[PDB]
């Protein structure tokens, strides 16, 4: 984990999808 580390792009896209998945389950108007 210290030679490979952690990217940024993938994490951004992932938390994005996660946000729009926790927002569609209840109510989706996030902006």
């Amino acid at each position: 984990v210290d030679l490979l580390g952690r990217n940024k792009a993938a994490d951004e896209a992932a938390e994005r999808e996660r946000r729009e998945e926790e927002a569609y389950a209840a109510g989706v108007l996030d902006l």
Binding site: E17, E20, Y24, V28
Partner: protein, 195 residues
């Protein structure tokens, strides 16, 4: 000259892209006169002709490739003459191999423009046979090279007029139901995009 409304093009979501299932860059190209799109074509008219259009393409290609092999062999005999007339007199073989490398370059470039024309015509055919509207063309050459041969089969344009014609030539309840179905069945981010 017709023109569109930025409010429904630039602001996210771009309503036009969503209505038509596009990306903006494509559309900012089609409206600011960069790429071309296909307003409509005929699928049943292009059905009973694919065979003979292949026939004409293939006869043209056999023609040019017969000329291509003729190029190869004729340049090769000229090269043999060049060597035989370069050695009969009193010169080293260093200069002979240099001039023969030049002649090799010659035959190479001949066969090269040859095969370049091959690949061009072949990709052109492969683009004709694979035609559905809303396709972009960043080329301006492929497009013209299709407008001269069979252009009258399909219909093309660019600008506000292209999107206009298209919108007119676009079923809506079919898309709406297919979208309801992609949402029902599909899942993931794809579900969200269809939503």
């Amino acid at each position: 000259a017709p023109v569109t409304h930025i409010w429904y093009f630039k602001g996210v979501p771009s309503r036009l892209g969503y209505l038509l299932d596009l990306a903006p860059k494509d559309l900012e190209k089609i409206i600011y006169f960069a790429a071309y799109v296909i307003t409509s074509v005929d699928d049943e008219m292009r059905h009973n002709e694919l065979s003979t259009l292949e026939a004409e393409m293939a006869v043209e290609k056999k023609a040019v490739e017969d000329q291509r092999d003729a190029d190869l062999e004729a340049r090769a005999q000229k090269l043999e003459a060049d060597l035989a007339e370069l050695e009969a007199e009193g010169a080293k073989s260093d200069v002979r191999r240099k001039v023969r490398d030049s002649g090799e370059r010659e035959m190479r470039q001949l066969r090269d423009r040859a095969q370049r024309e091959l690949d061009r015509l072949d990709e052109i055919w492969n683009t004709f046979t694979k035609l559905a509207p809303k396709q972009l063309i960043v080329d301006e050459v492929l497009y013209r090279e299709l407008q001269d041969r069979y252009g009258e089969y399909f219909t093309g344009a660019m600008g506000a007029e292209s999107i206009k014609k298209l919108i007119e030539n676009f079923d809506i309840d079919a898309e709406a139901e297919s979208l309801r179905e992609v949402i029902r069945s599909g899942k993931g981010q794809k579900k969200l995009r269809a939503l």
